[PDB]
Structures are given as structure tokens and as C-alpha cells.
Amino acid sequence: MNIFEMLRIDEGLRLKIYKDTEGYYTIGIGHLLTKSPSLNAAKKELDKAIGRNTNGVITKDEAEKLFNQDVDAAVRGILRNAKLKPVYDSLDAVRRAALINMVFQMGETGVAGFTNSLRMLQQKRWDEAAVNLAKSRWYNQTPNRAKRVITTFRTGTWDAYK
Ligand SMILES: [Cl-]
Ligand SMILES: [Cl-]
């Protein structure tokens, strides 16, 4: 299993603009287009992202291209972050993927807000980090995905995704 296959399980793949779990216009493999309620503002962000007039539809290649870009940015974003980088550096390969996942979903700011849980991950207190991670709007809004990510943090294996 790898980061790409893990996020592809968490986000699915859709080739037409859709609304995410929060009601925002998205396309592809969890690629947020905009928070505006305007569908037209979404189609425009899309064309700009793809460099062609799509009319709200993209191909599998176009979806994967945005995905590659998004994973890369999530990683680069964690490495540029004074609060996230140290955590990431402290973790093993599997758990590093769990952190990329949270950042891909909620952005670097959001994750940097998990202050206490980050400190626990760093100290390798797995059970206690998992309990804290669960006391969050994140967990209450997207419980099945949160549980998978949390179990990944707790065990250091891909069991939740297998
Ligand atoms: Cl983009
Ligand atoms: Cl969920």
C-alpha cells in the first residue's frame, strides 16, 4: 500500500464536478475547486486548473495529474511547516502516510491545529494520540475515514486499508 493508493481509497475518483462531504465543489481524487457556492465559479477554477475548456468534465489522466500535484504539494507543505516537519521527521514510513492524508484532507493549517495530538505522535504515545485525535470535529464529521487514519497512527500498519 502507499500514500497514493491510500488516498485513492479515502477519496474515490469522480470525473465530473461534485460536492464534497462539506458541500464544496470538487473533482477527481478529492481535488477541491472552490468553497464558493457558485457552480460557475467552480467550472472556471477547473478550466484554469486543467488549461482547457472542460465544461466540468475531465479525463482519468487529467484527474491523476491533479492528484500527483496535490500529493506533492501536501508533502512539500508539511516539510515547509515549522510545526509539522518535526513530527513527520519523527515518524516511520506508514505513519508519515497517515499524516500526509490528514494534510491532504484538511490543509496544513487545520492539521497544525491538532497541537496536543501532534505532540503525542512525536513522543510515540500511540494509544493516547489516537484517543485525542478522536476528540475532534474531523472525527465526528467523517468518522469512517478518521478511524482508518487513526488506526494507521495507532498501529503503524496498513491494516485498516486492507
Ligand atoms: Cl491547481
Ligand atoms: Cl467517513
mmCIF file of C-alpha atoms and ligand atoms in Angstrom:
data_model
loop_
_atom_site.group_PDB
_atom_site.id
_atom_site.type_symbol
_atom_site.label_atom_id
_atom_site.label_comp_id
_atom_site.label_asym_id
_atom_site.label_seq_id
_atom_site.Cartn_x
_atom_site.Cartn_y
_atom_site.Cartn_z
ATOM 1 C CA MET A 1 0.000 0.000 0.000
ATOM 2 C CA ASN A 2 1.205 3.530 -0.484
ATOM 3 C CA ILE A 3 0.066 7.119 0.017
ATOM 4 C CA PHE A 4 -1.487 7.222 -3.473
ATOM 5 C CA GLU A 5 -3.494 4.024 -3.041
ATOM 6 C CA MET A 6 -4.489 5.060 0.495
ATOM 7 C CA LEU A 7 -5.867 8.478 -0.634
ATOM 8 C CA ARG A 8 -7.490 6.924 -3.675
ATOM 9 C CA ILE A 9 -9.403 4.630 -1.254
ATOM 10 C CA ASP A 10 -10.312 7.622 1.005
ATOM 11 C CA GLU A 11 -11.398 9.979 -1.701
ATOM 12 C CA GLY A 12 -12.598 7.845 -4.631
ATOM 13 C CA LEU A 13 -12.473 9.120 -8.179
ATOM 14 C CA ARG A 14 -15.076 11.243 -9.946
ATOM 15 C CA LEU A 15 -14.759 12.666 -13.387
ATOM 16 C CA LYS A 16 -17.487 15.270 -13.102
ATOM 17 C CA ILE A 17 -17.636 18.213 -10.655
ATOM 18 C CA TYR A 18 -19.266 17.051 -7.393
ATOM 19 C CA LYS A 19 -19.823 18.330 -3.962
ATOM 20 C CA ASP A 20 -17.602 17.016 -1.188
ATOM 21 C CA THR A 21 -18.678 15.994 2.298
ATOM 22 C CA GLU A 22 -18.734 19.722 3.303
ATOM 23 C CA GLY A 23 -20.730 20.754 0.251
ATOM 24 C CA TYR A 24 -17.831 22.106 -1.751
ATOM 25 C CA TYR A 25 -17.238 21.728 -5.431
ATOM 26 C CA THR A 26 -14.533 19.105 -6.109
ATOM 27 C CA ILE A 27 -13.467 16.927 -8.944
ATOM 28 C CA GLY A 28 -11.079 13.980 -9.469
ATOM 29 C CA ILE A 29 -9.358 12.463 -6.490
ATOM 30 C CA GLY A 30 -10.502 14.858 -3.847
ATOM 31 C CA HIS A 31 -9.259 17.971 -5.637
ATOM 32 C CA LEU A 32 -11.074 20.988 -4.001
ATOM 33 C CA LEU A 33 -12.011 23.535 -6.649
ATOM 34 C CA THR A 34 -13.574 26.248 -4.575
ATOM 35 C CA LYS A 35 -15.568 26.998 -1.492
ATOM 36 C CA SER A 36 -17.810 29.421 -3.354
ATOM 37 C CA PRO A 37 -21.412 28.210 -3.811
ATOM 38 C CA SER A 38 -21.202 29.086 -7.455
ATOM 39 C CA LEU A 39 -21.023 26.238 -9.883
ATOM 40 C CA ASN A 40 -19.840 28.583 -12.497
ATOM 41 C CA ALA A 41 -17.094 29.849 -10.354
ATOM 42 C CA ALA A 42 -16.167 26.066 -9.994
ATOM 43 C CA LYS A 43 -16.111 25.382 -13.756
ATOM 44 C CA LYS A 44 -13.842 28.326 -14.110
ATOM 45 C CA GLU A 45 -11.413 27.173 -11.491
ATOM 46 C CA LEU A 46 -11.474 23.873 -13.230
ATOM 47 C CA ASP A 47 -10.546 25.184 -16.679
ATOM 48 C CA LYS A 48 -7.828 27.224 -15.142
ATOM 49 C CA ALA A 49 -6.518 24.134 -13.301
ATOM 50 C CA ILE A 50 -6.563 21.995 -16.496
ATOM 51 C CA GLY A 51 -5.699 24.591 -19.130
ATOM 52 C CA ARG A 52 -8.664 23.822 -21.397
ATOM 53 C CA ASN A 53 -12.390 24.369 -21.609
ATOM 54 C CA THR A 54 -13.673 21.360 -19.882
ATOM 55 C CA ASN A 55 -17.269 22.164 -19.363
ATOM 56 C CA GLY A 56 -16.973 20.464 -15.928
ATOM 57 C CA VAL A 57 -15.694 17.121 -17.145
ATOM 58 C CA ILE A 58 -12.118 15.799 -17.109
ATOM 59 C CA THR A 59 -10.472 12.527 -18.150
ATOM 60 C CA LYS A 60 -8.783 9.933 -15.938
ATOM 61 C CA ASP A 61 -5.299 11.307 -16.935
ATOM 62 C CA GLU A 62 -6.344 14.828 -16.016
ATOM 63 C CA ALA A 63 -7.643 13.551 -12.668
ATOM 64 C CA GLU A 64 -4.369 11.711 -11.959
ATOM 65 C CA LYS A 65 -2.339 14.695 -12.899
ATOM 66 C CA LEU A 66 -4.119 16.923 -10.383
ATOM 67 C CA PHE A 67 -3.684 14.102 -7.878
ATOM 68 C CA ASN A 68 0.048 13.890 -8.369
ATOM 69 C CA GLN A 69 0.273 17.613 -7.944
ATOM 70 C CA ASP A 70 -1.830 17.578 -4.809
ATOM 71 C CA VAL A 71 0.159 14.798 -3.088
ATOM 72 C CA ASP A 72 3.366 16.600 -3.879
ATOM 73 C CA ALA A 73 2.099 19.854 -2.536
ATOM 74 C CA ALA A 74 0.840 18.180 0.630
ATOM 75 C CA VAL A 75 4.289 16.683 1.220
ATOM 76 C CA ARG A 76 6.145 19.961 0.410
ATOM 77 C CA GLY A 77 3.736 21.811 2.586
ATOM 78 C CA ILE A 78 4.439 19.517 5.610
ATOM 79 C CA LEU A 79 8.249 19.972 5.037
ATOM 80 C CA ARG A 80 7.942 23.698 4.917
ATOM 81 C CA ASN A 81 5.886 23.771 8.057
ATOM 82 C CA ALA A 82 7.657 24.554 11.314
ATOM 83 C CA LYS A 83 5.023 22.628 13.307
ATOM 84 C CA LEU A 84 4.542 19.685 11.034
ATOM 85 C CA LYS A 85 8.007 18.956 9.823
ATOM 86 C CA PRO A 86 9.355 17.791 13.149
ATOM 87 C CA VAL A 87 6.500 15.377 13.598
ATOM 88 C CA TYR A 88 6.934 13.975 10.147
ATOM 89 C CA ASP A 89 10.671 13.594 10.653
ATOM 90 C CA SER A 90 9.998 11.642 13.807
ATOM 91 C CA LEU A 91 7.666 9.061 12.265
ATOM 92 C CA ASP A 92 8.162 5.836 10.437
ATOM 93 C CA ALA A 93 7.016 5.368 6.747
ATOM 94 C CA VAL A 94 3.487 4.180 7.395
ATOM 95 C CA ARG A 95 2.655 6.845 9.929
ATOM 96 C CA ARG A 96 4.153 9.506 7.658
ATOM 97 C CA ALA A 97 1.463 8.469 5.069
ATOM 98 C CA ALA A 98 -1.252 8.959 7.803
ATOM 99 C CA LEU A 99 -0.023 12.495 8.297
ATOM 100 C CA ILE A 100 0.065 13.237 4.545
ATOM 101 C CA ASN A 101 -3.529 12.045 4.407
ATOM 102 C CA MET A 102 -4.722 14.413 7.140
ATOM 103 C CA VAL A 103 -2.937 17.307 5.467
ATOM 104 C CA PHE A 104 -4.373 16.449 2.038
ATOM 105 C CA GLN A 105 -7.887 16.452 3.543
ATOM 106 C CA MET A 106 -7.778 19.433 5.860
ATOM 107 C CA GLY A 107 -4.858 21.502 4.805
ATOM 108 C CA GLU A 108 -1.738 22.316 6.736
ATOM 109 C CA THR A 109 -3.419 24.916 8.888
ATOM 110 C CA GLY A 110 -6.119 22.575 10.032
ATOM 111 C CA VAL A 111 -3.623 19.846 10.920
ATOM 112 C CA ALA A 112 -1.285 22.285 12.680
ATOM 113 C CA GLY A 113 -4.388 22.878 14.887
ATOM 114 C CA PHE A 114 -4.050 19.284 16.263
ATOM 115 C CA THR A 115 -1.384 20.576 18.656
ATOM 116 C CA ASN A 116 -1.736 18.130 21.531
ATOM 117 C CA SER A 117 -2.114 15.077 19.238
ATOM 118 C CA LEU A 118 0.989 16.104 17.302
ATOM 119 C CA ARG A 119 2.959 16.245 20.499
ATOM 120 C CA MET A 120 1.788 12.791 21.405
ATOM 121 C CA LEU A 121 2.695 11.408 17.961
ATOM 122 C CA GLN A 122 6.145 12.843 18.407
ATOM 123 C CA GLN A 123 6.572 11.118 21.781
ATOM 124 C CA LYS A 124 5.358 7.895 20.238
ATOM 125 C CA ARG A 125 2.414 7.655 22.683
ATOM 126 C CA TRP A 126 0.136 5.840 20.112
ATOM 127 C CA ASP A 127 -2.824 4.897 22.225
ATOM 128 C CA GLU A 128 -3.059 8.315 23.813
ATOM 129 C CA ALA A 129 -2.651 10.111 20.429
ATOM 130 C CA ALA A 130 -5.443 8.055 18.951
ATOM 131 C CA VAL A 131 -7.772 8.930 21.844
ATOM 132 C CA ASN A 132 -7.029 12.662 21.439
ATOM 133 C CA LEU A 133 -7.245 12.626 17.644
ATOM 134 C CA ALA A 134 -10.876 11.270 18.083
ATOM 135 C CA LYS A 135 -11.995 14.406 20.042
ATOM 136 C CA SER A 136 -12.321 16.496 17.021
ATOM 137 C CA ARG A 137 -14.911 17.799 14.591
ATOM 138 C CA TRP A 138 -12.881 15.825 11.959
ATOM 139 C CA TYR A 139 -13.655 12.535 13.598
ATOM 140 C CA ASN A 140 -17.312 13.359 14.272
ATOM 141 C CA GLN A 141 -17.951 14.571 10.678
ATOM 142 C CA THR A 142 -16.023 11.880 8.794
ATOM 143 C CA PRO A 143 -15.854 9.005 11.261
ATOM 144 C CA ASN A 144 -15.098 6.108 8.921
ATOM 145 C CA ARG A 145 -12.193 7.825 7.211
ATOM 146 C CA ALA A 146 -10.944 9.268 10.579
ATOM 147 C CA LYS A 147 -10.936 5.822 12.131
ATOM 148 C CA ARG A 148 -8.826 4.441 9.300
ATOM 149 C CA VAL A 149 -6.282 7.227 9.623
ATOM 150 C CA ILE A 150 -6.315 6.959 13.437
ATOM 151 C CA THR A 151 -5.815 3.175 13.402
ATOM 152 C CA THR A 152 -2.883 3.754 10.972
ATOM 153 C CA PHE A 153 -1.369 6.094 13.614
ATOM 154 C CA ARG A 154 -2.120 3.645 16.411
ATOM 155 C CA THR A 155 -0.694 0.516 14.836
ATOM 156 C CA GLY A 156 1.841 1.634 12.248
ATOM 157 C CA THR A 157 0.389 -0.865 9.714
ATOM 158 C CA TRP A 158 -1.981 -0.654 6.721
ATOM 159 C CA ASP A 159 -4.440 -2.972 8.347
ATOM 160 C CA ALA A 160 -7.298 -0.530 8.164
ATOM 161 C CA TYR A 161 -6.936 -0.268 4.480
ATOM 162 C CA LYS A 162 -6.673 -3.928 3.726
HETATM 163 CL CL CL B 1 -4.252 23.587 -9.255
HETATM 164 CL CL CL B 2 -16.155 8.872 6.683
#
